[PDB]
A = this chain, B = another copy of it.
């Protein structure tokens, strides 16, 4: 990436202001918020499921909960503990609502951009 990050050096120098400059501050602002609201949710839900384990459980299980939890968001489907065949009617409705949680946070990016490029962007 670092040698390919040098491809932004070839522009030169910019003095004429565009409208996309103020847009990329909010792009950098909320995507970093989007990553932290992701990772604190994945850690928090994995730490939640260890609290369900009342019998002994093992401290090495938390590494197995967080490993299987990351793969569901990508879609690898190569899991170790969570069997979707065990509880089918609950695994779907948590996964459907997980799509709805993520799809609105993507639309919060676009509305924050569309609600910005109309009134005050012509002056600011």
Contacts and interface: CB of A to CB of B under 8 A. Distances in A.
Contacts of A89: 67
Chain A interface secondary structure, helix, strand, loop or mixed? helix
B111 A23 contact: yes
A13 interface: no
Contacts of A109: 107
25 contacts: A4-B40, A7-B37, A19-B114, A19-B118, A19-B119, A20-B111, A23-B115, A67-B88, A67-B89, A74-B92, A74-B96, A74-B99, A76-B84, A78-B85, A107-B109, A110-B110, A110-B113, A111-B113, A114-B117, A117-B117, A117-B118, A118-B121, A118-B122, A119-B121, A119-B122
